[PDB]
Ligand code: HEM
Ligand SMILES: CCCCc1nc(Cl)c(CO)n1Cc1ccc(-c2ccccc2-c2nn[nH]n2)cc1
């Protein structure tokens with residue numbers, strides 16, 4: 001049988017009982033009644049929730065292959081999203097993911113490293129920040145340009161000037177779609193309608209925005225097909241075309257210009273908003289806890305100095321800053337329920353039997369805010385990742401990127417972006433708040449499955 005859960009109602013299941021304001025809090029409430037594994041019904045669609053480290057670990061890690069599916073919902077069909085990496089399944093997923101991970105290794109695309117691309121972007125970021133001339137600033141836009149440009153550089157090999165209008169169009173389309181996708185109407189309510197789409201104009205805008213991006217990618221790809229040097233692949237496209245070559249004699253192949261376009265859009269989608277938000281939240285928490293910022297700066301001064309860019313090598317000698325980055329991630333809990341999973345076959349879990357294809361919802365919040373691993377999990381405190389001697393203290397509960405076979409492809413990349421961008425900023429600036437560090441609230445603003453920071457402004461004061 002399935003795991004227990006609140007008795008669903010006829011037809012609507014458990015829908016009218018789950019506080020949609022903050023699904024994560026609701027799942028936690030439920031776990032207080034039904035335990036670490038329970039079922040909920042969306043219509044007659046069951047969804048098994050895993051809550052707590054032990055349950056998430058055995059599912060995602062111990063029974064990893066069985067829980068490597070991506071749970072699909074009507075929205076997947078409606079915004080054409082099952083044809084790259086994030087929303088794919090089976091062989092298509094495995095091959096594209098595998099290829100993607102290899103291509104994204106630090107030196108996976110030629111002599112120019114991922115680190116180098118990030119470092120260059122950090123340089124540009126500091127520059128654009130300087131241009132604010134220390135005036136009040138809503139850093140949303142600037143912080144979003146950086147991670148986006150890193151993807152551009154990884155995919156097209158070229159970064160854009162922050163005012164190159166083709167760059168500005170890309171970001172606009174991305175931002176638009178993200179905002180749309182973040183509406184509870186689109187995340188929740190539209191998914192009740194199994195066969196009929198109630199927001200047709202919206203799904204049309206989404207697709208239109210994608211079309212524009214794919215059509216920009218297509219042009220870059222033609223240019224790349226032209227100046228193809230087989231022995232010197234320089235970006236994700238070069239690599240993807242070279243994989244295509246090895247595939248000839250392997251029809252049909254998972255690698256096609258279509259899947260390339262789709263994969264590249266996924267990278268843009270997955271690689272630019274979460275990192276960008278996490279950067280934005282970090283500055284806010286640093287404004288709120290200036291003593292933390294000061295220590296990060298003391299480590300930057302001592303280990304890196306002022307005569308050179310930060311680099312990944314410096315991280316191991318900067319336990320405190322490392323602890324800070326980790327803590328930001330843990331505290332903010334950006335993807336409280338990760339992305340939905342689905343079992344790939346009939347499976348026995350604990351004392352229950354979960355049928356193949358059943359949707360699985362993982363509570364990352366439950367792990368990240370584990371009250372024993374992280375006393376006072378609701379408070380921001382770098383000491384959560386530090387030992388008595390001030391050394392960095394790793395945690396099995398550090399899962400902001402999820403865990404298992406579906407773990408974030410960008411785990412390493414995001415790590416580099418956070419560390420390098422944050423160190424760079426604080427190497428060249430002090431942060432000044434408009435209001436008083438005692439007044440601003442840093443509590444995340446939850447809306448359905450989304451969790452973001454509140455609005456704020458600051459001044460980047462050159463050192
Ligand atoms: C702070 C930044 C980021 C966070 C917190 C984050 C977190 C996550 C999470 C929670 C998932 C869901 C995994 C699951 O299904 O269990 C995910 C998926 C993914 N992330 Fe990210 N991510 C970040 C940045 C990036 C970046 C920069 C990339 C760029 C390569 C990226 C690429 C992906 C991809 C491709 C997936 C889909 C994985 C799959 O289905 O196999 N992410 N990420
Ligand atoms: C009918 C095909 C038009 C598609 C489209 N492309 C762009 Cl671009 C626009 C700008 O609104 N649009 C139209 C659009 C119209 C209404 C919405 C919308 C906004 C808020 C709340 C509900 C809707 C909605 N979508 N579908 N029906 N109502 C979204 C996009």
Ligand SMILES: CCCCc1nc(Cl)c(CO)n1Cc1ccc(-c2ccccc2-c2nn[nH]n2)cc1
Nearest residue numbers: 079081086174177181206209210213265266269270
């Ligand atoms: C020009 C188009 C902008 C981005 C874009 N809009 C559409 Cl629609 C797609 C297909 O999902 N995408 C690609 C997309 C791929 C993955 C995600 C995703 C990746 C990791 C974690 C959460 C997200 C997510 N899914 N929905 N909203 N944000 C977001 C966007």
Ligand SMILES: CCCCc1nc(Cl)c(CO)n1Cc1ccc(-c2ccccc2-c2nn[nH]n2)cc1
Nearest residue numbers: 073075076187188191335336337338339340449450
């Ligand atoms: C194909 C899309 C499936 C997503 C979905 N539809 C419904 Cl209905 C459910 C939960 O009843 N869910 C679970 C879910 C929905 C959206 C997200 C999401 C979308 C954009 C940005 C962040 C998130 C996120 N993932 N986990 N928490 N928040 C995450 C989980």
Ligand SMILES: [K+]
Nearest residue numbers: 199200201202
């Ligand atoms: K309409």
